[PDB]
Amino acid sequence: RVISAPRGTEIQAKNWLTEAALRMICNNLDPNVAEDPDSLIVYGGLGKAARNWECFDEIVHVLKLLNNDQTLLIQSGKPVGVFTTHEEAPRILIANSNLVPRWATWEHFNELDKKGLMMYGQMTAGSWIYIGSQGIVQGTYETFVAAAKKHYQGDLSGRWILTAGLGGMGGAQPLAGTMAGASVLAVECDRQRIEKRLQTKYLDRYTDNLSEALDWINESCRRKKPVSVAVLGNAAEIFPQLVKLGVQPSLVTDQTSAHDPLNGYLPLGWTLEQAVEMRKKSPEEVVDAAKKSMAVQVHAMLEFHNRGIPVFDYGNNIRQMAFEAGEKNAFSFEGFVPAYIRPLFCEGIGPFRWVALSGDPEDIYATDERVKQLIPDAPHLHHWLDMAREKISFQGLPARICWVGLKDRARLALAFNEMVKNKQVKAPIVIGRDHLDSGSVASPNRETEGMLDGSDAVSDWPLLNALLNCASGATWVSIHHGGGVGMGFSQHAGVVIVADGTEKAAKRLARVLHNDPATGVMRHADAGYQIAKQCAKENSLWLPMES
Ligand SMILES: NC(=O)c1ccc[n+]([C@@H]2O[C@H](COP(=O)([O-])OP(=O)(O)OC[C@H]3O[C@@H](n4cnc5c(N)ncnc54)[C@H](O)[C@@H]3O)[C@@H](O)[C@H]2O)c1
């Protein structure tokens, strides 16, 4: 079967709110969107839109029948019950992959999955708001722009980024970096992955000659004309060579699969084929050689850091692996979350995502221009919107992501609702986000690692986020376990609300798009961040325990 979101202005559901849910679950399985839709897999290996095909078919059946005062419960991708609520409550409540903590393991998940009892929601797979690769590209752009703002007055022209890994997430770095105004040198050991990124226009050039790569980079930095270059090789060899050469990248990071020393990171001096064979004969030797290689790479990263260059981790655990392998100074440079993302979270600045249910790209282009009107002094935002139009291809329903703070989300949502009402877009707009927002994630090895107060693992917050978005009038609300970092390691919440042009939706939008980022300002003010405390006061939040 081939699934895609219905289009245009005719609806099959009883109203546009449940029509939106119908379109969004189908869009998650669009062959231009999903990684393996035949198995209902949206992204992330096992992130599914529904538990199985019987469940998918029944979800579609229920969504077309739900009245505006009925609410469907989704339990790990299964439509288990419909109950009467009211028009100002969500039409769907979703809880995916949640396991009592001592059972929150892949071993138990798999046992339950084999019995037909489980589904992995990842983040946006089980909660029907996945929009393809734009999420990763935009998020990587956001990080590079945050680094540019912090270190270079927002200007990367004539500068270049050194990184490694062109995989499922790392492959976004060339495009994100050049969109951000920098040239990019990315080390990658798999030639087939390089060739794929070349074919799909995610990468400009590659070579196995490091000197040639540098001459290309320097020529582009001279011309102030960003280029992306992949060097075929091993980051544990190339990074120390670049240190020895005295070259001057303006940002250094890494997205090798360092989190997986057995199956991910290629040891120094090994071929891909040798790694394949050694994993079958001697897994412990593979792990040891990989971690020792990571220590060599991190030692080089530290030398750039010692020379005053901004160096940051990109959430792949490479510092801890290198530390364990003997690089005792591994943590002298920061992770990208505490350095760049958490300060944005402290102002409720986070992923703001919207989807044109009409299917018409002109709907998104109209909303792009409107965002630029509403936030006129934001060059990195305007540049992103302009560059996304020509560089980012829509997948399934046209959609857009940008990062928007507590001060502005509701303004944008209400403007979108007005555009639906006055026909400046052809059909209603779905507004949501991934689950990685200021108030909606507890993930002590990633987004809440190293909180000032040590509250990394407190998961009250995403549960309150979901309950409050339910209370506030979101169209569907989701509570998920284990997205990104796997079973046992995160708890997070999603929210989607439909702007259908009505005054009733306007009231809901004004609450949800304020309250949802405000919970993140609250959460970070609670942890002690003055940036968040200041933001709370600027937005007149009622935080009873805050002075
Ligand atoms: N939000 C975040 O925290 C965030 C964002 C992006 C990436 N990451 C992390 O970055 C890592 C990469 O993610 P991915 O999805 O791209 O993984 P992936 O497994 O798809 O890609 C890793 C890439 O590294 C390459 N590689 C392995 N060893 C290498 C070496 N020695 N030298 C050069 N290249 C090498 C592999 O060939 C592969 O293409 C993961 O740990 C991921 O969690 C995190």
Automatic annotation (TrEMBL):
Recorded metabolic or biological pathway in which this protein acts: Amino-acid degradation; L-histidine degradation into L-glutamate; N-formimidoyl-L-glutamate from L-histidine: step 2/3
Subcellular locations according to the entry: Cytoplasm
Family the UniProt entry places it in: Belongs to the urocanase family.
Organism domain of life: Bacteria
Protein name, per record: Urocanate hydratase
Lineage: Bacteria, Pseudomonadati, Pseudomonadota, Gammaproteobacteria, Legionellales
Domain Urocanase Rossmann-like: 132-340
Cofactor note: Binds 1 NAD(+) per subunit.
Stretches assigned to the Urocanase C-terminal domain: 343-537
Residues annotated as domain Urocanase N-terminal: 3-129
Purpose of the protein: Catalyzes the conversion of urocanate to 4-imidazolone-5-propionate.
Organism in which the protein naturally occurs: Legionella pneumophila subsp. pneumophila (strain Philadelphia 1 / ATCC 33152 / DSM 7513)
